[PDB]
Design a protein around this ligand. Structure first.
Ligand SMILES: [Zn+2]
Ligand SMILES: [Zn+2]
Lengths: 71, 149
């Protein structure tokens, strides 16, 4: 069971900035670059938008801590 | 499987640069979605001295679906059956796209050191593991000698 497009779109999104600390998306194991769109879950773990959105279309938990995304 | 292929190559390169202590894995031939793995028997286990072969087949939508991992070497273990199937939650309901093959291999090694008789894929071996531990150790050593050495 996944989330709807509306529930996914309600999750916060940010653009990786020029001054931001480097992180790696755990889904694609690729380090972020400037301009990347990142989506953060209520548990504060964040991913590439396209990476986590694909997982959440069929699942409802965080890939890292396995907490439910919805209330 | 374009995105899957890139992650498979990434994992293969990371395994080559930082090899895990008791395990190795890589494609058999030119099929990047089909790997062979070898796991050395843990020293604190009746599988000590044995080398256990496994197959790993990545689905086209990896890592959003788990890889199919199965033993090809016969082994006496309550969580591994005669088809090589492995009763490991992270290979089934608990799969996550943040998991990697190297983490799967480490978890399998821990399963060899510490079987879970309360999730019995082979109920008869789990029964013997619960009721006669030295008999389990003897047979596991016998199978390691016959099949894994
Ligand atoms: Zn990503
Ligand atoms: Zn989380």
């Amino acid at each position: 069971r996944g989330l709807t497009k509306e529930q996914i779109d309600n999750l916060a999104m940010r653009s990786f900035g020029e001054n931001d600390a480097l992180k790696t998306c755990s889904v694609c194991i690729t380090e972020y670059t400037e301009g990347n769109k990142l989506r953060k879950l209520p548990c504060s773990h964040e991913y590439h938008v396209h990476c986590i959105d694909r997982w959440l279309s069929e699942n409802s938990t965080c890939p890292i801590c396995r907490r439910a995304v919805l209330a | 499987g374009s995105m899957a292929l890139k992650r498979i190559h990434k994992e293969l390169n990371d395994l080559a640069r930082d090899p895990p202590a008791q395990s190795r894995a890589g494609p058999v031939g030119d099929d990047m979605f089909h790997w062979q793995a070898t796991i050395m028997g843990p020293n604190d286990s009746p599988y000590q001295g044995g080398v256990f072969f496994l197959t790993i087949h990545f689905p086209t939508d990896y890592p959003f679906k788990p890889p199919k991992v199965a033993f090809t070497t016969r082994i006496y273990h309550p969580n591994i059956n005669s088809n090589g199937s492995i009763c490991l939650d992270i290979l089934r309901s608990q799969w996550s796209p943040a998991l990697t093959i190297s983490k799967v291999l480490l978890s399998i090694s821990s399963l060899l050191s510490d079987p879970n008789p309360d999730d019995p894929l082979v109920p008869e071996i789990a029964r013997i593991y619960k009721t006669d531990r030295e008999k389990y150790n003897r047979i596991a050593r016998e199978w390691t000698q016959k099949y894994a050495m």
